[PDB]
């Protein structure tokens, strides 16, 4: 199937004393593989998946130097933005950045991203052409003008289409046993009476990977959205995901209702019905 590599960075200023709190995480699809936390003791980029542990010292030295360089840019950025927005040195502010690449089933470049937020709102983002910038406001327009004069997008496009894609293919190969394995959801239906004349039927999807999934209810073969509840997909904590969808039904009418599960690990969608007895 399709694959992606993404890095997420968050820097939060601490105006009372010292430098910002900086947290960086790298992902291959839905699997975290590296992390850096400015509050941790190592002061190094650390592994979070077994397939990355095999990389040598030159890799870890290089990723540590780069992640510390990203930390220092975010520290400077917090100061720059405070100035652009005419804000005081008293409050805490946040800068977030995300970048990465997507590849198709052939492992060839599909899309690249590189975007920023300030205090949780869009600041500047690289357009899908990987040549131009979207600046949300006049402060971001000042950054856009600087980045255009400095060939920033040229370097980003080279990284996103080349380096990013090449290393993604390497990680996919080294981590093939888990990264290229799809875990189809283990599904079941539970029944919870809400009174003597109504019940909730809850359709569960457990232990699946990747996180993307669709759960839908039908009544007499027609889509049902009323009296329905769908929880957000959530991590199980062992690398897999969970989700459930529920419907309130008149007791005795359970057999008209079917739950439909769609996931990359399923060649055909699954259909679930309540087993009464």
């Amino acid at each position: 199937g399709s694959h992606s590599m993404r890095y997420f960075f968050t820097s939060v200023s601490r105006p009372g004393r010292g430098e910002p709190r900086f947290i960086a995480v790298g992902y291959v699809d839905d699997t975290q593989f590296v992390r850096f936390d400015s509050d941790a003791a190592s002061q190094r980029m650390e592994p979070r998946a077994p397939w990355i542990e095999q990389e040598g010292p030159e890799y870890w030295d290089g990723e540590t130097r780069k992640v510390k360089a990203h930390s220092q840019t975010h520290r400077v950025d917090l100061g720059t933005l405070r100035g652009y927005y005419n804000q005081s040195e008293a409050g805490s502010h946040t800068v977030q950045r995300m970048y990465g690449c997507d590849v198709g089933s052939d492992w060839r470049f599909l899309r690249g991203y590189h975007q920023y937020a300030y205090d949780g709102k869009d600041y500047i983002a690289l357009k899908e052409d990987l040549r131009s910038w979207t600046a949300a406001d006049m402060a971001a327009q000042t950054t856009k003008h600087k980045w255009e004069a400095a060939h920033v997008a040229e370097q980003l496009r080279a990284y996103l289409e080349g380096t990013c894609v090449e290393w993604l293919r390497r990680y996919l190969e080294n981590g093939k046993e888990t990264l290229q394995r799809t875990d189809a959801p283990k599904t079941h239906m539970t029944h919870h009476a809400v009174s003597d004349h109504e019940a909730t039927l809850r359709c569960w999807a457990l232990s699946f990977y990747p996180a993307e999934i669709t759960l839908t209810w039908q009544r007499d073969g027609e889509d049902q959205t009323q009296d329905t509840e769908l929880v957000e997909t959530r991590p199980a904590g062992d690398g897999t995901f969970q989700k459930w969808a529920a419907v309130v039904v008149p007791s005795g009418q359970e057999q008209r209702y079917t739950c439909h599960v769609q996931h990359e690990g399923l060649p055909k969608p699954l259909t679930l019905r309540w087993e009464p007895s």
Binding site: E63, H70, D77, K146, Q155, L156, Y159
Partner: peptide, 9 residues
């Protein structure tokens, strides 16, 4: 791997 690009706001 991370990028090795200087990109200040």
């Amino acid at each position: 791997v991370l990028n090795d690009i200087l990109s200040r706001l």
